[PDB]
Design an enzyme around this catalytic site. Sequence first.
Site, PDB file in Angstrom:
ATOM      1  N   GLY A 111       0.819  -1.188   0.000  1.00  0.00           N
ATOM      2  CA  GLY A 111       0.000   0.000   0.000  1.00  0.00           C
ATOM      3  C   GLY A 111       0.855   1.240   0.000  1.00  0.00           C
ATOM      4  O   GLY A 111       2.028   1.191  -0.380  1.00  0.00           O
TER       5      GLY A 111
ATOM      6  N   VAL B  37       5.348  -2.689   1.128  1.00  0.00           N
ATOM      7  CA  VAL B  37       4.906  -4.070   0.916  1.00  0.00           C
ATOM      8  C   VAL B  37       4.776  -4.863   2.205  1.00  0.00           C
ATOM      9  O   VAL B  37       5.659  -4.835   3.074  1.00  0.00           O
ATOM     10  CB  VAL B  37       5.847  -4.844  -0.007  1.00  0.00           C
ATOM     11  CG1 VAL B  37       5.542  -4.521  -1.432  1.00  0.00           C
ATOM     12  CG2 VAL B  37       7.292  -4.497   0.315  1.00  0.00           C
TER      13      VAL B  37
ATOM     14  N   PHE C 295      -1.223 -11.703  12.266  1.00  0.00           N
ATOM     15  CA  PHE C 295      -1.763 -12.088  10.983  1.00  0.00           C
ATOM     16  C   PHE C 295      -3.253 -12.428  11.082  1.00  0.00           C
ATOM     17  O   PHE C 295      -3.675 -13.117  12.006  1.00  0.00           O
ATOM     18  CB  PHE C 295      -0.963 -13.281  10.447  1.00  0.00           C
ATOM     19  CG  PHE C 295      -1.380 -13.723   9.077  1.00  0.00           C
ATOM     20  CD1 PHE C 295      -1.072 -12.955   7.965  1.00  0.00           C
ATOM     21  CD2 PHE C 295      -2.130 -14.879   8.910  1.00  0.00           C
ATOM     22  CE1 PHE C 295      -1.502 -13.313   6.712  1.00  0.00           C
ATOM     23  CE2 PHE C 295      -2.574 -15.255   7.653  1.00  0.00           C
ATOM     24  CZ  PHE C 295      -2.256 -14.464   6.547  1.00  0.00           C
TER      25      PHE C 295
ATOM     26  N   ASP D  35      -7.254   6.738   6.158  1.00  0.00           N
ATOM     27  CA  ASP D  35      -7.268   6.012   4.890  1.00  0.00           C
ATOM     28  C   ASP D  35      -8.026   4.688   4.938  1.00  0.00           C
ATOM     29  O   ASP D  35      -7.524   3.667   4.474  1.00  0.00           O
ATOM     30  CB  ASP D  35      -5.821   5.791   4.407  1.00  0.00           C
ATOM     31  CG  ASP D  35      -5.738   5.318   2.955  1.00  0.00           C
ATOM     32  OD1 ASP D  35      -6.606   5.687   2.116  1.00  0.00           O
ATOM     33  OD2 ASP D  35      -4.773   4.576   2.653  1.00  0.00           O
TER      34      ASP D  35
END
Length: 280
Positions: free
Chosen positions: A13, A17, A75, A120
């Site tokens: 983004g 990475v 994660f 964002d």
Amino acid sequence: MENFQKVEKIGEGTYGVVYKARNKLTGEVVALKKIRVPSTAIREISLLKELNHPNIVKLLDVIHTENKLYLVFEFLHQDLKKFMDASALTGIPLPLIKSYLFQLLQGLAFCHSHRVLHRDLKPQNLLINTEGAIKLADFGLARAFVTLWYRAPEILLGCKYYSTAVDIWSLGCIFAEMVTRRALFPGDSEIDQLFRIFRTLGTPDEVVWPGVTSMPDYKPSFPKWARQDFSKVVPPLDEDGRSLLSQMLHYDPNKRISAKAALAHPFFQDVTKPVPHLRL
Ligand SMILES: Cn1cnc2c(NCc3ccccc3)nc(NCCO)nc21
């Protein structure tokens, strides 16, 4: 780094990475983010390492090595964008949409209370697990250190000192998207973005938004559009959902609903936590 077996590039983004990696030592799978070095960036980050909440993707470690910065996050198995793409043929049921927005408002409310903005939000940085939980990823990196679709109108008009209200706008946009299975304002340029908002909600003025005409990028030359009814905008959503959305999409940043206030809306009165059938 050498402590990780970069098993995949799960994305990339504005800030670099992201990789799915395994900790050579602990054996845990983590999201490694190579950031793309300011003593301040470092200090803002350290603060983020310390802000924990059930709906915020946990920042496990900060590796400032060889004048490089890597952020290590927990994660999560899927992102909202992919999940919606899978559901596009049946839509995400309302009970799930409602649970997800509720959880998202809690995350936002926790951050906003600490004066931490995301700036964002987009389906892609909303991550979900098989457990039915959803969390906000990349919270606060914006301050530490491209789709215009979820951009708040005050940002488009040149405001430089924006508030937490920019996140509520983004969230309202996402909310609409899950409901209709189509992006609310799919703008292809900042002005296209702005006129798409104007064509649906009507051109803002001093009445609905006092101070608007003095905005930096505001031009008297803007076309005057009329406001469309929400019934037509989000055809499937009930009255409670529409009034909530309406309040999230108010032009005036100071009139736009807060995350805490939104949690108390009657729309969340029958919220539950169903489990999603994810395909991993
Ligand atoms: C910080 N972080 C923690 N888990 C994830 C995750 N997990 C979802 C995921 C898993 C496998 C492949 C792709 C995405 N996806 C992403 N970025 C994806 C947005 O494009 N970042 C993450």
